[model samples]
Target: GIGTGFPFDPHYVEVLGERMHYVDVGPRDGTPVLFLHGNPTSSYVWRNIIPHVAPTHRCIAPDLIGMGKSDKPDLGYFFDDHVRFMDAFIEALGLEEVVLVIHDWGSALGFHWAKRNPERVKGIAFMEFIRPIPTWDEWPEFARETFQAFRTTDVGRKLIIDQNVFIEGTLLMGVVRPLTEVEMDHYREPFLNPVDREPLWRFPNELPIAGEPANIVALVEEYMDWLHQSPVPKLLFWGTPGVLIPPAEAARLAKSLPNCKAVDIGPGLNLLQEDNPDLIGSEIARWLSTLEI
Candidate 1:
């Protein structure tokens, strides 16, 4: 079943008393390359990208708890909750000296883990990932309106929980082209029921509005320093225009890192995996070649 369309073995690791699913592919003894995805998407986000690197690296892409085939316990699904699960996943796998490729919410967990275990980190490659949110005035009008509409409120809850507008509408709009029926079904499968869709609703509400969840905000600020100070090699894959990290913010982030290089993957939206995976995959492969890992 794992080899249906995915050219890898689907494996599970017990974490937090739940079965966490992951796709473990390529050479067992090869360098560890961990790919972490965000909401509404699973390890499948890396499906197209991993093939390019699986030839040389051990590609381990896990479905975060409550996602994909992973166990979905009814927790608050807070930022801290995700960090704990991710920490467990890494420890469960006995992964050390890892190269983390993260996106969206995964960035929060990835950067936090890296901040704590800098010794285990070999390098970080991220794209359209989380960053400290600028103030309302600084955020572009489009960004402000979108978040405002999606803020934790009655309408927002209905739209996300009942209607699934975020997944069925907002997410699809970000992609360059329409997903095939199969791909769309795969992405939509896990959150079919209203109860199963709690994490989807929670992630949007946790968007650091009005300085809520001060812990997440504090960590974002803290890791900014961790990332800026760490001498670890970093690669930033950004495009001209994306929903969150636009070209300007991408350049700013690239400048902030000590040993970082940023590349524009042409005109891509937030969901570049749907179209730009080859570009991103090859770039990371090229970057890894230079590293002595």
Candidate 2:
């Protein structure tokens, strides 16, 4: 059940023929602060981070379709499928003036949404999100080797489906500290078997390495332009020894954006939410306070 540690009442919306699940906390009239999680995680990731902001801003965290409590349909869990659900979910909720807080796959979906509807977006805060896939020659040796396994169909499937490695291994290895039994259960609950773990298997494949998933790659490339051109207040959070956005890149990103800021919230690998929720939350709350809107 989603009621594990999240104190907020669980809510569901019928979007695109699927029952999308989410947790809405704080006042309905307050500005919407939507928290979107990446694969193998749900709104639960924001449990510790939302409370600090929910008091003053409405916090909405949705479980992507085919993950968490959302209805799992038998379809290819492609990046397009995710964006479709995200589009429907936002429309159904009529969420205007949204401040997006995204990580992992949420990065692409949220940024794409923000780019398309820049007028409605208030701001965005992203952490350890995807960057455009670099060519093998451009990638550092370690990154090239690491991504090669994911880009390979057989190896990626074996790791995600056959061994349940994304949830069982990548997560455990990325977190700063060992997760408790309960925390592990919350993540493990969704993908109990190979059939249920389809979403996890497909997410990494969407990286568009070597020009695959051209559509997603285009969207990311498009959003990079938007991030540079759009004046929307942006917050970038990254951790050291990070999987995606490293320190050098984070520093460059802060300077590159039109109106952006950056924070180094310590090393928690890719899943910093599990490691430094306090810093992540407080920094966001403080940044939001600075926004003129």
Candidate 3:
């Protein structure tokens, strides 16, 4: 089963009241590839590419808390808090020598935990889907104002979470065209209820605005430092049309990292793999063959 441990699955039970699910596959002794899903999506996003790499690597994919089969708790939806939980999850699962593959907000959570333990990283592959860059003007004024607009009031909450405006926005913002009905189902399951949508709605507000959320700014600084210091073999494949992760920023980050390379997939969006999983999988597999472990 693709969603082996998804909550609500007849065969599975909740893990201490958390609604999250996980898929742990491949050889027991194989090196681990931890695939993290972005907001509004779950480990299902990686299902297409997981089998491709399973032959050579142990693949462990998780539904982010509040999304997928994971918990839908209303408490502690901050990005850093997400990172803390992810670290604890990793340790609990006994994952090591991890090669992280992330997208969108997944980058925030993965990088947040990675900065805390860089030595454990064997490699990384991520899209340029950073919501907050490592700078003061990471978000434009109107964008920040827009996010703040929803965060401060009640109406915004209903539109964003209760009514699932953000989910609709994701379909528009993620790519050029609509995903297949089957694909859309994978993205929509975790958000069947209003309370389950907290992470999706609240995550956007966690953007690092300078001086205001001083802790967030500090996190930005720390992430930037980790990006520069990571000695792990790295590669990023960005989508050309989506333009979610700015082209220049992708180049800048690749240059800053000790060992990194990047490729631009033609006209793909934030969901580059879904746009072309075969190509993404093949490129990553070929690259993995060259790594030490």
TM-score of each: 0.94, 0.93, 0.85
Q: Candidate order by lDDT, highest to lowest? A: 2, 1, 3
User: Considering TM-score, where higher is better, how would the candidates rank from best to worst?
Assistant: 1, 2, 3
Model 1 per-residue lDDT at 129: 81
- Worst window of 10 by summed lDDT in candidate 2: 138-147
Q: Candidate 3 at 184: error in angstroms? A: 1.9
Candidate 1 has its poorest 10 consecutive residues by lDDT at: 1-10
Tell how far residue 245 is off in model 2, in angstroms. 0.5
Best by lDDT: 2
> What are the RMSD figures for all models against the true structure?
2.6, 2.6, 3.9
Which stretches in model 3 have alpha-carbon errors above 4 Å?
1-19, 134-151, 209-212
Residues 145-193, candidate 2, lDDT per residue (tens digit)?
Answer: 6556865678878878888988887788677777887899989988886
Model 2 segments more than 4 A misplaced: 1-4, 136-147
Tell me how many clashing residue pairs each candidate has: 0, 0, 8
lDDT of 1 by residue, 31-145 (tens): 6999999877888888888888888999999998988889999897877788889999999999878998998888878888999999988999998787766676544465566
How far out, in Å, is residue 158 in model 2?
A: 2.4
